[PDB]
Structures are given as C-alpha cells and as structure tokens.
C-alpha cells in the first residue's frame, strides 16, 4: 500500500548498522520467479553493500521452524511469494512489540486475493499489494471499516442484518482461486527503475521472471511485452554489429518458438518433445508421429538432418528457419508457435532462448542435486536450490549445460511416461471435472518434486485438450514411491488454445480446505502452494469421493 | 588464390581473437603445445561454429580442400609465437573432437562422403607404421631440374615437365621430410 521507492528508503533506514544489519530475505519457494526476483534484489543489496541472510524455504510449515527459532537483532525482514494467501500475523504471532514497530516484514507476492487480515491492520506489513490489485477491491475495504468495531431492538436487528450483509459479500472474497496477477520480478524492476539502475543482466533477470510462467498462461503477460520490449529499446550494446563483438554481446529480439530446446537439442527431438506440439499433432499416437515426418517432408528438411544437433545444421536451413515455418506450419494449425521472444547471446559460447534458460533452471531444481525421511528429502531440495541458483550467474556457464543435459532427459522421462498413460486411457471424465491418478510408473523419483508434476500435469492437461471439444476440465494427478504412501497430489488449471477469455481461477485451493475442515483424512497442506497437497493411500479414496462431492464448481 | 588468403586470414583471426572469458584458449593451446614439442592443436568445433558459422559452413562442405589451408593457417601463427626474428617448424596437425551426432557404422552409406563424420567402434588391430611424405625434393634424370614439391593432404603423381619423358623425376631421399601413418581397422 506504499510507494516502492519509499518502502525502499524505509528498508534502508532500518538496515545499515553496527553490527550489520540485520535482515533475512526469504526466497520462496520453488518458483523460478522467486530466483528471478531475489537475484536482482540481492545484487541491488550488494550495490550498497548491505549485509544479508538468504533462506531457501520449501515447506510453508517449514517457515515456522525458522521464524520461531532464530531471530535476534533483525529489525527489518523481507519475504517472497508467501503470505498473500494465509496471513502470518496469526500464523506467527505477533504479539505487537513496542506504533513505529521495530520490525518490518516486507511480503512480496503475486498471489490473489490477499489475505484479509494482511493489508488492513498494519503490524507486520508494509504490504506489497501495490500496484496490481489496488484496486478497489472495495470489497475488502468495506470488510473492516464496517466490521470494526460494530426501539433499540430494531437497531440491534438492523445492525446484525447489516453485519451478515457485509459477511456474505466478504465470504465471496478470500474464498476464491489463487491466480498470479503480475510476476513479482516485474514489480521489483518497477522498484528498481525508480532508483535508476538500467543494468543489462538485471533486465535479463526480468525477462527470466516474466518467462518463468508462460508455461502456465500469461495471463497479463500477453500485454507485458510492451513493458519489456520498451526497456529492451531503452538500451543497446551497439547500433550495428561489429561482429560479434566478444563483449556486449547482449540480448535481442528473435522469432522464438514455444518449441522445446531448439538451440541446444536436435530439431526432430525438439518437435517430438515440445509441449504445445505434443497436443495438436497427437504425438503419443504412432499414427500421428508420422504427421511430424510429413511436416519435415513439407519443409524439405532431411530426416537425417533433423536428427543432428542444432549447432551443426546447415546454414541454408538456418536462414530459412523463419520462412519455411511460415510456408508450412500454417497448414497444420500450428500457426501459433512463433512468438516475439528475447534471446541473450554470450557470443562464442552460443545463444540462449529466454524460455530454454528457464527449462535449464527447472531441470536443475529436481535433479543433478517417518518425518526424518521427508525432512531429509526436502533438505536435498534445499541444497539443490543453490545448485540452481548458481546457474543464473554469468561467469559460470559450465554447470548451466549440466542443467540442459538434464532438461532433455526429464522430457525423455516425462514424455515417455506421459504416453504410458494415454495408451491405457487412464483419464476419468467423471461428471463435474476430469481426474486421474498414476497407480504405477517408472522412476517416481523424478516425480517427487512439485514442479515435475507441474510440468507433467501441464503436458497432460495440454495434451488432453487441444481443444478438443468440450469443457476444459481441471486435471488431477498422483504418484508414490517411498516415504510410506505420501501419494503427492497437485491441483491443476485448464489450458485454453490461445483464445484466453477468462483467468478461470483454480478452485482446488478451496475444495481442499473444505476437506481439511471436514474429516481431514491424512490431508497435508505442507507444500507451499494451495493447489498441491499430500495424502495416504488408506485415506486417499474416501478423500477422492469427498472431492467428487460436493463440487464447488 | 586470393580466396585462400581470405580463408586463412579468417583462421588467424579465429586463433588470435578467440575468447572464452578471458584467456585465449587456442592461442595458449598453441604455446603450451610447441614448448613440450607436441606440434599439434586441438580445435573444439563448438567454439568454431560459435565464432563464425561461415567457416564451419565451408569446412563441412569440402573438408579435404580446406583443412590443409587451416593447417598452413595455424603454423603461420606459430611462426609469430614460438620464435621471433628481424626454423625448422613443421606445419602442425590439428585434431578436432566434437559432439555433433553420432553416426553408427551400419548407417554409413555414400551420400556423406567427404563430410566429417563422428562415430563409435572398438578397434580390432593397429597396422604397423609406415611413412608417407610431406616435403620431398626431386631431380630430373636428364635436365636435372631441382624441384621441391610440397605434398599436402588431403594418389598424387609426379610432374613430367621441366624428351624429356615420360616421367623423369627421381625422389631425393636425403632431403625429404616424412611423417607417419597407422591404419586402424575398427569393428
């Protein structure tokens, strides 16, 4: 509810001291956006050389272990991606200490709607709600100034009728789907441009941030291109090349493709594993696989030349890469492939597509790495976080490729198993919504991570619906290996075929909390996201039955 | 042959200006190779194709007409590094190993002939060494023409012109520079 620059000067005044400082910025959690945000944030701190702690939090339940344990001198705290949904004032408590409260916890979140207790009643925040939903948002505005603090019998009856009158519309709010408005990174950059830093790798961090989520919607991002492209116009390494030159040597616009790993993998394998194209061409089917080859017969690209790594393909095919696709792809309905994208060239190393980089980092997060076992695993993910954090750095590229050799493999897993599902037609159309469960599969170790099931769930909800009449219906998935029937189950959102009228607001967040409040059968919201929960095989089936009814949508 | 000048200038500009941040990998590959008396260079194609797409476009086109202009191109560089003046320095062999796409043995049938092919197999037996030639002098049986033939590679017959004929040219083995050869045979 504040100016970004002024919130900045506040976090400046409470910061620098002897001993320095102290602030812990919480990077959270598994979302690439977090990295994108906190890296340019951390670089900004290093600019004024302000000491910082930075914590890799996984579990939402895990945050309590930290904040309740170690705090001493820390008068100014910062947090990322948490608290937009569940309020930490009740969750942490707080317990006001010393107006002009000593500690300011900044909470940065893209999630909506905000918790009601957060924005109004200033204690721990210093909210980041600005500027996306301001709004009004008159529904939260009347939620308090009316409620607080609230012949005489008719005035009591009138008063109470008014109270429930506000409580109904208030109940409409805060019970709703969790949907990201704008990427937190973008706003950190809006905060950053007011201070005056135009830095190139910074901007690349923004591009990374925005393009973190294009796998899932945009939704506003379709109109974020002005806010990026203009900035790309606010700077330039040289008016003209001047090949290369070995330095600056920076990012530029190119006809990029939702196509998967075009530059770091072989072309044919790049269609065959791509996510958008899995769908339209029915590639899980042997009968459709051929249709790809017909694409190549249309392009005049040899099959043998399609099998070869993209660095080494002939030059003629490169110069025709932006034409041939226009000549052909239009006929297959694949006409939405070509985006205007961002590509940063490091020169003699190669170039990297904005999206593919994100595929590298995601790749890093799950691989390349009774409560003791889950804690130890979540711990392994915590360590792995930094292995992924390092790849963002420019000076070490040598491990970034270790991401990509993984990012390929994962797909080779994901695709494979994905097909293993469609052969058995495991989709349960049900009535109100679509649902699935993986009872058996190869290498569930890869599927342990929330984000792995976010991407498999994504290629699957993308595959089932082209569309593909009728009625985009949200999907459900489940997997188990070890940790005694943890059976991780993540919520999902429907995918429109590039024509998106409504955000549609994932409802699993609410539907799960209704069940935690009913019989709560081995239901665990331990994962940071409201869409993803844990379950046991003993209680999963009654849970599934209680999921089927009553349907909130 | 101004074109060969144009190609070799690009190869020199590829060796002297190449930067992996910030050491020059090749240029030092060179020095550290002449000192141990290795007289070789190993190019990494990915860096090559990174540098110019063009020279790799031609190098995968007609390799055997180009690669020796790359050899002479690099040895003309070691002249400016390993020594200085104002010998003898053999033209270095380049060894290029790169990822590309593995092409199995069964799948080699014509069509890629004279195009660089990475592959994989278990060597059966190695043939006993024998020398080919690199630089050999030649005198005529009659007019006694003294000809220094620089043989390259890239089989090659001797020139018949300074009766005389048909092929009056003798190999002088007292001045002739020789290299070695192996013949692997791989299953």
The major pleated sheet of chain A works out as: 4 strands, parallel
- Strand elements of chain B, count: 7
Question: So what's the overall shape of chain B?
Answer: globular
Query: What is the rounded distance between the termini of chain A?
Result: 32 Å
What is the overall silhouette of chain A?
globular
From the N-terminal CA to the C-terminal CA of chain B, the straight-line distance is: 42 Å
Please tally the helical runs of chain A, counting DSSP H or I stretches of 4 or more residues.
22
Query: Which assembly state applies to the chains in this document?
Result: part of a larger assembly
Strands of chain A, total number: 10
Strand order of the largest sheet of chain B: 5-4-6
Q: Number of helical segments of chain B?
A: 5
Biggest sheet overview of chain B:
3 strands, antiparallel
Main location (chain B): nucleus
Protein name (chain B): Minichromosome maintenance protein 5
Organism (chain B): Saccharomyces cerevisiae (strain ATCC 204508 / S288c)
GO cellular component, one term (chain B): replication fork protection complex
What does this structure look like?
Chain A has helices at residues 4-13, 32-48, 60-69, 88-92, 116-119, 138-141, 152-172, 184-195, 200-210, 224-233, 267-272, 275-280, 286-299, 303-307, 315-319, 324-332, 354-366, 371-390, 400-422, 450-464, 508-516, 537-548, and strands spanning 24-27, 53-56, 76-80, 104-108, 251-254, 341-347, 350-353, 477-479, 488-490, 532-533. Chain A is of the alpha/beta class and 553 residues long. Chain A starts with a helix and ends in a 5-residue tail after the last helix. By secondary structure, chain B is α+β, with helices and mostly antiparallel strands. In chain B, 32% of the residues lie in helices and 18% in strands. Chain B has helices at 2-16, 25-35, 45-51, 53-59, 63-81, and strands spanning 40-41, 93-94, 123-126, 133-140, 146-150, 169-178, 184-186. The termini of chain B are far apart. At the A-B interface, loops of A face helix 3 and helix 4 of B.
């Amino acid at each position: 509810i504040s100016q970004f620059s002024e919130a900045y000067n506040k976090i400046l005044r409470n910061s620098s001291s002897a001993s320095s400082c102290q602030l812990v910025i919480f990077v959270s959690c598994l979302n690439i956006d977090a990295l994108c945000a906190t890296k340019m944030l951390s670089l900004l701190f290093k600019k004024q050389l302000v000491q910082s702690q930075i914590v890799p939090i996984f579990g939402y339940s895990e945050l309590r272990r930290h904040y309740s344990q170690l705090d001493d001198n820390i008068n100014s705290l910062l947090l990322v991606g948490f608290g937009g949904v569940i309020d930490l004032e009740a969750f942490l408590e707080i317990d006001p200490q010393e107006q002009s409260f000593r500690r300011d916890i900044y909470v940065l979140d893209a999630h909506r709607p905000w918790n009601l207790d957060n924005i109004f009643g200033s204690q721990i925040i210093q909210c980041f709600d600005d500027g996306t939903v301001d709004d009004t948002l008159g529904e939260e505005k009347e939620a308090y100034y009316k409620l607080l603090e609230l012949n005489d019998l008719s005035k009591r009856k009138q008063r109470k009728k008014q109270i429930h009158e506000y409580e109904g519309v208030l109940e409409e709010y805060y019970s709703q789907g969790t949907t990201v408005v704008n990427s937190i990174s973008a706003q950190i950059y809006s905060l950053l441009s007011a201070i005056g830093e135009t830095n190139l790798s910074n901007l690349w961090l923004n591009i990374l941030g925005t393009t973190s989520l294009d796998i899932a919607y945009a939704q506003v991002y379709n109109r974020l291109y002005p806010l990026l492209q203009d900035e790309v116009k606010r700077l330039t390494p040289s008016s003209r090349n001047s090949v290369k030159t070995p330095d600056t040597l920076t990012l530029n616009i190119q006809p990029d493709y939702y196509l998967f790993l075009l530059r770091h993998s072989s072309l044919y394998d790049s269609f065959y594993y791509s996510n958008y194209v899995n769908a339209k061409l029915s590639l899980w089917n042997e009968n459709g696989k051929k249709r790809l080859h017909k694409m190549f017969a249309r392009m005049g690209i040899p099959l043998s030349t399609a099998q070869e790594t993209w660095l080494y393909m002939d030059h003629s095919i490169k110069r025709e890469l932006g034409i041939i696709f226009d000549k052909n792809l239009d006929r297959y309905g694949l006409q939405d492939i070509i985006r205007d994208g961002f590509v940063r060239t490091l020169g003699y190393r190669g170039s990297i597509s904005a999206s593919e980089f994100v595929e590298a980092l995601t790749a890093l997060l799950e691989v390349g790495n009774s409560a003791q076992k889950l804690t130890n695993l979540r711990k392994r993910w915590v360590s792995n976080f930094w292995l992924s954090w390092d790849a963002l750095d420019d000076r070490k590229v040598e491990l970034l490729n270790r991401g990509i050799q993984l990012a390929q493999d994962l797909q080779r897993a994901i695709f494979n198993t994905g097909v293993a599902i469609l052969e058995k037609k495991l989709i349960k159309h049900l009535r109100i919504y679509r649902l699935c469960v993986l009872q058996d599969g190869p290498d569930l170790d890869l599927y342990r991570n929330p984000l792995t099931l976010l991407r498999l769930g994504n290629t699957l909800i993308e595959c089932c619906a082209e569309s593909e009449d009728k009625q985009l219906l949200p999907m459900v998935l489940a997997s188990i290996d070890e940790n005694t029937d943890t059976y991780l189950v993540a919520g999902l959102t429907p995918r429109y075929p590039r024509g998106t009228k409504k955000p549609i607001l994932n409802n699993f967040s609410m539907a799960f909390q209704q069940i935690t409040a009913e019989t709560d059968a081995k239901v665990r919201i331990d994962n940071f996201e409201s869409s993803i929960i844990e379950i046991r095989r003993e209680d999963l089936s009654p849970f599934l039955e209680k999921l089927t009814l009553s349907g909130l949508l | 042959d101004d074109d060969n000048t144009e190609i070799i200038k690009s190869f020199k500009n590829f060796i002297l200006e190449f930067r992996l941040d910030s050491q020059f990998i090749y240029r030092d590959q060179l020095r550290n190779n002449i000192l141990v008396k290795n007289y070789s260079l190993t190019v990494n194609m990915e860096h090559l194709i990174g540098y110019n797409e063009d020279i790799y476009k031609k190098l995968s086109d007609e390799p055997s007409d180009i690669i020796p202009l790359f050899e002479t191109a690099i040895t003309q560089v070691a002249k400016r590094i390993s020594i200085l003046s104002r010998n003898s320095l053999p033209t270095f062999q380049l060894i290029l190993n790169s990822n590309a796409n593995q092409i199995p043995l069964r799948d080699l049938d014509s069509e890629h002939v004279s195009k660089i092919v990475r592959l994989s197999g278990i060597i059966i037996s190695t043939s006993v060494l024998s020398s080919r030639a690199t630089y050999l002098s030649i005198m005529c049986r009659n007019c006694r023409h003294t000809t220094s033939i620089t043989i390259n590679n890239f089989t090659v017959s001797l020139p018949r012109s300074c009766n005389c004929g048909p092929d009056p040219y003798i190999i002088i083995h007292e001045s002739s520079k020789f290299i070695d050869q192996q013949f692997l045979k791989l299953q």
